[PDB]
Ligand binder design. Structure first.
Ligand SMILES: [Ca+2]
Length: 223
């Protein structure tokens, strides 16, 4: 997250870190056994880390649970990033508490202008590289579909939205991928892609979670 703020420990209780020996992507806890992330974060050998603040220090509220299964969306296209969403099942259920909590799925799509909270452990610089140990947060609005398409000609599908600031300076970034965009207490987006980070006229692009609720629910119900 570039241009954001330190969230505070366990203030974003649905935020997960995906770990394969190291943090590599975010995710969102949607029930005691399932995490939603980006398909471009897929790899084997995932350990889900819940209850994290500093990802390099054991602070006392963590739960580390290996994944049993991952399910990339059936129509994910890694070239275009269309349908950039995946589900990860935990080998054992998380113990839910004030610091480790699910986030609700949307029951309708959010609108441009709605303020959302974007979070992660990704790079905090737009030129250059610095990776935080503690969770970072950014409040940002959803942008109109027409501004999004204009910013990224030929690249924005109906399964994507833009959020952020056209002036630059405030955005998600590498290492935030897979993490949450939460608006009014609902998971509306997944950190997906952008041109660089925090660049003028190049807002963040996010997977549009509301399009996937039926697939998520049906997949969980049978897996
Ligand atoms: Ca920790």
């Amino acid at each position: 997250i570039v241009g954001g703020y330190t969230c505070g420990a366990n203030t974003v209780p649905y935020q997960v870190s995906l770990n394969s020996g190291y943090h590599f992507c975010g995710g969102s806890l949607i029930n005691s056994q399932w995490v939603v992330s980006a398909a471009h974060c897929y790899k084997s050998g995932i350990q889900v880390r819940l209850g994290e603040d500093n990802i390099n220090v054991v602070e006392g509220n963590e739960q580390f649970i290996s994944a049993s299964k991952s399910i990339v969306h059936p129509s994910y296209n890694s070239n275009t990033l269309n349908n950039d969403i995946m589900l990860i099942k935990l080998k054992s259920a998380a113990s839910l508490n004030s610091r480790v909590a699910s986030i609700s799925l949307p029951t309708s799509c959010a609108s441009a202008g709605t303020q959302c909270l974007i979070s992660g452990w990704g790079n905090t610089k737009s030129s250059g590289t610095s990776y935080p140990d503690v969770l970072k947060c950014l409040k940002a609005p959803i942008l109109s579909d027409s501004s999004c398409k204009s910013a990224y000609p030929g690249q924005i599908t109906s399964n994507m939205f833009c959020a952020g600031y056209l002036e630059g300076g405030k955005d998600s970034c590498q290492g935030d991928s897979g993490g949450p965009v939460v608006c009014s207490g609902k998971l509306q987006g997944i950190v997906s892609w952008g041109s660089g980070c925090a660049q003028k006229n190049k807002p963040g692009v996010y997977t549009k979670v509301c399009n996937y609720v039926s697939w998520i629910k049906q997949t969980i119900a049978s897996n």
